[PDB]
Amino acid sequence: QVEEVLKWQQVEFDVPASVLSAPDGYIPINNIPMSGVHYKNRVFVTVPRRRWGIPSTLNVVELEPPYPVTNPVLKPYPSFELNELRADLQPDANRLVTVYRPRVDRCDRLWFVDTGMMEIPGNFTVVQRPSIWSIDLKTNQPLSRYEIPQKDVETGYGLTSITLDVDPDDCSKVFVYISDLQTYRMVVYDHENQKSWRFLHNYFFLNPLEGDFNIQGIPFAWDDGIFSIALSNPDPMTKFRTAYFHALSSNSEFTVSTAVLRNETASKRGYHGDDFKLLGYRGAQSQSSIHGFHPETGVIFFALIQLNAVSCWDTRKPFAPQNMAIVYKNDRDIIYPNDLSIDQEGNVWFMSNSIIKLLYTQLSLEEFNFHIWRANIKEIIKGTVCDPTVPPNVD
Amino acid sequence: QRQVEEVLKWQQVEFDVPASVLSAPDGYIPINNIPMSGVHYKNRVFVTVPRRRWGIPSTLNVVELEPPYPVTNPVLKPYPSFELNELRADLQPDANRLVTVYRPRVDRCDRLWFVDTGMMEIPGNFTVVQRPSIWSIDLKTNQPLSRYEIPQKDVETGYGLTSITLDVDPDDCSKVFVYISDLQTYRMVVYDHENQKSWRFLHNYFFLNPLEGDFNIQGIPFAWDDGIFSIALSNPDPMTKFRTAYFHALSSNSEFTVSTAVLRNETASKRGYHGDDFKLLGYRGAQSQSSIHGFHPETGVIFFALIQLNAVSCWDTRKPFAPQNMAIVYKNDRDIIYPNDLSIDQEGNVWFMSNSIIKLLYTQLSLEEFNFHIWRANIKEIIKGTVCDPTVPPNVDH
Amino acid sequence: QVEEVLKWQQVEFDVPASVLSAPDGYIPINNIPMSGVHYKNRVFVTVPRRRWGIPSTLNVVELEPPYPVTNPVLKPYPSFELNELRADLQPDANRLVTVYRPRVDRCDRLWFVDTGMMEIPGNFTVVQRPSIWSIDLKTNQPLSRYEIPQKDVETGYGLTSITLDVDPDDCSKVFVYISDLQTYRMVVYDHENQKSWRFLHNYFFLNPLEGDFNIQGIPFAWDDGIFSIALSNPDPMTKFRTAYFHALSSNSEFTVSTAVLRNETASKRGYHGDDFKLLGYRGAQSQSSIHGFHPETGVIFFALIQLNAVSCWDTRKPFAPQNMAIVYKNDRDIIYPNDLSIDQEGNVWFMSNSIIKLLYTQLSLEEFNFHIWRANIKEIIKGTVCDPTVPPNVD
Amino acid sequence: QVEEVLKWQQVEFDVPASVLSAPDGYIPINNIPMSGVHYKNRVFVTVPRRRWGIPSTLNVVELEPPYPVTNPVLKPYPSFELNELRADLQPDANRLVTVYRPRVDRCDRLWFVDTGMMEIPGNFTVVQRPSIWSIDLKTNQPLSRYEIPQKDVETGYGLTSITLDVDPDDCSKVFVYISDLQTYRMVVYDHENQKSWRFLHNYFFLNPLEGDFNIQGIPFAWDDGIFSIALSNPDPMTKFRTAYFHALSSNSEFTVSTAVLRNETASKRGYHGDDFKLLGYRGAQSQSSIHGFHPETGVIFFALIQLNAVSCWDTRKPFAPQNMAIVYKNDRDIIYPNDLSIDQEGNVWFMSNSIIKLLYTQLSLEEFNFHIWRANIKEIIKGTVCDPTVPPNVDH
């Protein structure tokens, strides 16, 4: 029902031996994949440069059964020329420094944010400013690039997550919502008018008490804020969408109309009033990392961090723990769910990268550390409370 | 509880009507007169006595407020006149007379709205005198403005038309919609005032919850099968200019919502399947079966009249609908037997009433004790500091 | 083990051509069979007049291998003279207007209720008052006919199900419990004394949330209440029986002693107190239409509407989903299980009529729309949880 | 029994006219006092440089009847030479740029932190690095100055609150705890060994839902974190104390032993474990700004922002709303309680500067905008639940 598609012990790259032979040109243990997204027969894996020895940040893998695919070699996408890291570390608009979590739209495009910053412990290296890319997945040729001005974000330290808002009619009308979990803000990007603005709010911050975890018997505490944003279907009368968002270190979900996020004048306000709302409580130890909204079913899938599971919620039902169901739970393999995406085929994709083991213990490249799963949405929710046909619980 | 005033109180209800009507046999019976309403306008309070039995001289009445409070055993004066409240012995349909009136509503336009069921629910002999009709009375002149007979296509008799909710346009006042709650046939009948048309909605959510229909008030057990009973409207949405209709059944601990954009849609009423238009809001709480509830435009707070808990609770509509995001503002197990009515005036007060209907139906009603109570509470003051206060933030589980 | 016995693409009647040739005397699409019962290797099929062009409401079919028999012609029972429809539409005590679900007892008698009402969309026509019938199945001669008084039920709109309570010794001592899913009541009928009374309770109502269905991708909601009643064997001590009843739109099962249902003075109460009991939750999407109790095995067979299946339960085991088993499931054929009955031969009979396709979509007469199955009870429960010898999954 | 000591319509300085005449030297409405602290008939009033036109940041006022003293002229302390702002805005270790809330100890010294930064709307000007000062109140001569290294704090943007931990025996043994409500951290200062270290923790952050205020009909929302710290009495031997701390936008109080804060090795941890504890919920709309702990009675006094009041709590009774009492409330005068201090004379001092009026509306220099009160602690709590002799209202 939920098949493991890709798994790695460590990450290898399809690059010249010149890069592998060079000193500090490739360290296996430093290469941690932070994203896995699906398109056609291609899965894009990203390796953010949070360490030294990372040949390529944006990569791609060709799917071929049987699953699970063992240690697929990452091919630098779109090309290794772009994923080449300059020794001088100087700004270049035709290079990719660090890419976290890309998203695929209906227009056969790949959207991602190049932070332009390497978060090496000790040496924070800001190579260039953060930029928002779009790639044509049909030609494999970059379509647009937008450098984010200083007035919106300083460095792009926390720009690790993006949400696409594409008009159902015109494919040119696109808005992108970036979650900064470091600076506790939301960067809005107007693709049509090539403008951008930032939103500052208290709800983007964590919950002090809900920031402590214990995974794989490893205790830790994070102060990470807004991390993920999920969009509902357009309102028939208003044409606007409801943005479900939450902080990493939070058991609470919040909502806001895109009418507000698409309003540049609203961003500059010091007080946003009652525009941002509290949805409700997701549940004990129900801290989510990434979540996505399925347009067909109207079901939001949450990547639970502490519970090592993936849950779902039918947006039509009241937001409560008893109106949510766990569709998959794996305490052995799912250490930290680093990514969750919904593809154009009606599948839910989620990933674990065992990042906790690297941070607080030793990671062993003998074990399979990196896992990617997929599950058919309509089939996984069939019997559960997430099925729209199934009524909500009485509690 | 220490800032809620009792305004009116009765042991028995009497009437300022001709002695010819009071003297006549079965023209006035003391124990049969049970008021089901208490609404405030300016300096007077409108009390209704539905003819659920015999000996009911008048249904719609009015009382002038005058200290000291509470006013003991006020005489109910037929409104607008006794000529309209005089029951015909022939029992023929009277298009200019009032048979049975339950729960009136007052709007901002100085009008009084109510529904004349035209039906007397006497135990043993159900008498349908005429068809159900909606009224509008000018409170300045005390003259009836309009009367609309509800077609058979919408309601059969009007047996359960004991609740009304007004939807007046914030801009114009001639544009009016009325939502009537039928707790007997389990439906909502919609009335378009300007176009003088009406239609009905049928839905499963208008029914009761089989398990949540048992009560025990004052040590008197009973069960009711009453459905959709009360509707409360939010402020018009700034973008769509529509409202959210909070509605619940009497025998249910659940609250539901629906956009007035659906209710105002005549073609949508004739559908067999309404789809996801009607949604479940959430669980109000254990033993939290409500009778009548009202929404205060200014604060955005809903006051529920809790039947089993013999109390009145409030809820900020901005906060998620949850037990911990609700507070009890007033509780009185002695006086509040059954909260029969709850209304929100134009003066920023919440009015609620108990009529001890249970003690008449299932036990003995004593005219030696006070059985009927009307209360008033300032909304902004009663919520100040509570979770009902919009300025106060919502709570969480942990 | 479970074999299809009868199946129709449409239903035809063996009656004078004069009736078929008459103006709108027979419309193929309007004739929907609502039941199928087995007695002495005979099958009685009923076609309630919920439309125009329905020659006969009560019919019979002779069983003859091989099975399934394709498109058997319905034979009016007991004769066409009774099933004839009067043009003047006046009440006739010796005629059958509308019959839903007949039942067979151990005393070789056929019980059914003529509603005397035609539920045509546009013109609800009440021909006559509802009447309960008894037929001697050995002589095919009517035995008894009782008109239900207005004090008990008004129109007989929702009298579509009956349960027989015959004394194990005397065949004259008979009580019949009718289920009114429209007015939400239970009509009790005392055969011996020729009296009757009604019961009103909250438990006869539906559950608001549990009324939404989606069969064959067709969404719809029904407000139908108490629909079926099943009687256990007499208690060895008090000789009273447990009446298991449920609403159509509900996942909950209820119980009440027949001592209460047989009690006319208890009928006149406004409050029944603690007399009616909640048995428990049958399961998610486990809304049942008709159910029967098998005296020999003490097993109840439920006709699941949403699951398109037939389940069983051992009454001795605690009423829980884990203590129930699905004995037959057929998403292709079983759209709506319109009837389920337990014959005298130790078989469970169930039927599907594709009613929803008529109401919400269009019914194709080129496909088989009407199905009747039979299954040996002792053999079907052998290796399941419904087997009395097998212990429960949940204490 | 609570008396108003000082009240201003606007702040004026005792400085040469050459400074007040200077271009953008003295803009009245930009001069907002942020602290009023007491010492032997002297009140030290500070005016942080959050805007242009502020002659002196650290000032003093001599107390003399009758009270309340109307529009006292601020006198630069210890002198104008130190408070004078350089026109070239270059770093100078003998200059005071911006001081917020000074604190007085038992050893007759005045502690405060010069942020060295001007938080001017538009262009935040960092003149110099933040420094921790001590002044002898007997000689009015600066005793010590310690520049805080970049390893601990970036600029000193949020260093607006300090808590003194002086050893009961030796006056030379001092620790200072600095609350940074902007970078959400606590800076520890070792005075004896002239070292310093920072602390990061989730509890220093605000509570998202508890950040919205409505004062004087003025709606606003703040994201400010750990803002105040209060110290209990020291253990008779180990001389460790309990540090009661809270964020500005929070209805929760938190505790931590000084044994942890005084531990430099513990500061460099990435996970502090259960060392920082949650005390409990202070009450609805009970967001506190500054609070202090009175050694004698053991009572903490909270400055309530939203309730426009001052509440107390006995540190022996369980931390719960019904175990706390409002000793003073004034919706008219108390707009934003900007500072609260406990003196060596057994009085509680609190102040309101109407900061929100300047921020979100207009400030009238015809109205009294700045207020400073005092109250005898043992007298104000006499009957209340805050009295140690009075029993608690709930067991909790």
Ligand SMILES: *[C@@H]1O[C@H](CO[C@@H]2O[C@@H](C)[C@@H](O)[C@@H](O)[C@@H]2O)[C@@H](O)[C@H](O[C@@H]2O[C@H](CO)[C@@H](O[C@@H]3O[C@@H](C)[C@@H](O)[C@@H](O)[C@@H]3O)[C@H](O)[C@H]2NC(C)=O)[C@H]1NC(C)=O
């Ligand atoms: C884009 O957002 C702009 C700023 O945000 C608005 O103002 C806030 C105070 C809130 O009202 C918020 O909901 C709203 O988005 C805004 O320029 C613009 O429209 C605003 O909509 C306001 C809705 O109330 C409305 O405010 C008006 O002005 C303020 C100063 C007060 O006087 C209000 O009583 C008055 O209604 C106004 O249309 C406008 N507000 C402002 C500040 O300009 C919004 N975009 C669109 C298309 O509406």
Ligand SMILES: *[C@@H]1O[C@H](CO)[C@@H](O[C@H]2O[C@H](CO)[C@@H](O)[C@H](O)[C@@H]2O)[C@H](O)[C@H]1NC(C)=O
């Ligand atoms: C009244 O109800 C009908 C219900 O069918 C609404 O109809 C539909 O609207 C969309 C597009 O407008 C159409 O695809 C479907 O047939 C919907 O059901 C109708 O809009 C509504 N009328 C109004 C304006 O309230």
Ligand SMILES: *[C@@H]1O[C@H](CO[C@@H]2O[C@@H](C)[C@@H](O)[C@@H](O)[C@@H]2O)[C@@H](O)[C@H](O)[C@H]1NC(C)=O
């Ligand atoms: C900071 O960076 C220095 C540069 O070192 C080199 O950087 C790149 C080119 C990698 O190849 C790396 O392996 C090289 O060492 C480091 O020498 C220095 O140690 C770094 N400082 C810290 C504190 O991490």
Ligand SMILES: *[C@H]1O[C@H](CO)[C@@H](O)[C@H](O)[C@H]1NC(C)=O
């Ligand atoms: C505090 O500092 C570290 C952190 O726990 C620890 O090693 C040390 O023992 C503690 N206290 C001291 C200084 O002994």
Ligand SMILES: NCCc1ccc(O)c(O)c1
């Ligand atoms: N993915 C780890 C990001 C992180 C977590 C906790 C922190 O305190 C922090 O500064 C950064």
Ligand SMILES: NCCc1ccc(O)c(O)c1
């Ligand atoms: N307030 C009495 C309304 C009521 C309650 C139960 C019933 O069965 C009924 O017909 C009517």
Ligand SMILES: NCCc1ccc(O)c(O)c1
């Ligand atoms: N099963 C058909 C009977 C039925 C179903 C639903 C209804 O709403 C109704 O009035 C009648």
Ligand SMILES: NCCc1ccc(O)c(O)c1
């Ligand atoms: N004067 C209070 C400081 C403050 C409050 C809220 C903010 O969002 C902020 O940046 C600064």
Ligand SMILES: [Ca+2]
């Ligand atoms: Ca694929």
Ligand SMILES: [Ca+2]
């Ligand atoms: Ca962080």
Ligand SMILES: [Ca+2]
């Ligand atoms: Ca008045």
Ligand SMILES: [Ca+2]
């Ligand atoms: Ca009823």
Ligand SMILES: [Ca+2]
């Ligand atoms: Ca047989």
Ligand SMILES: [Ca+2]
């Ligand atoms: Ca029905």
Ligand SMILES: [Ca+2]
């Ligand atoms: Ca801040």
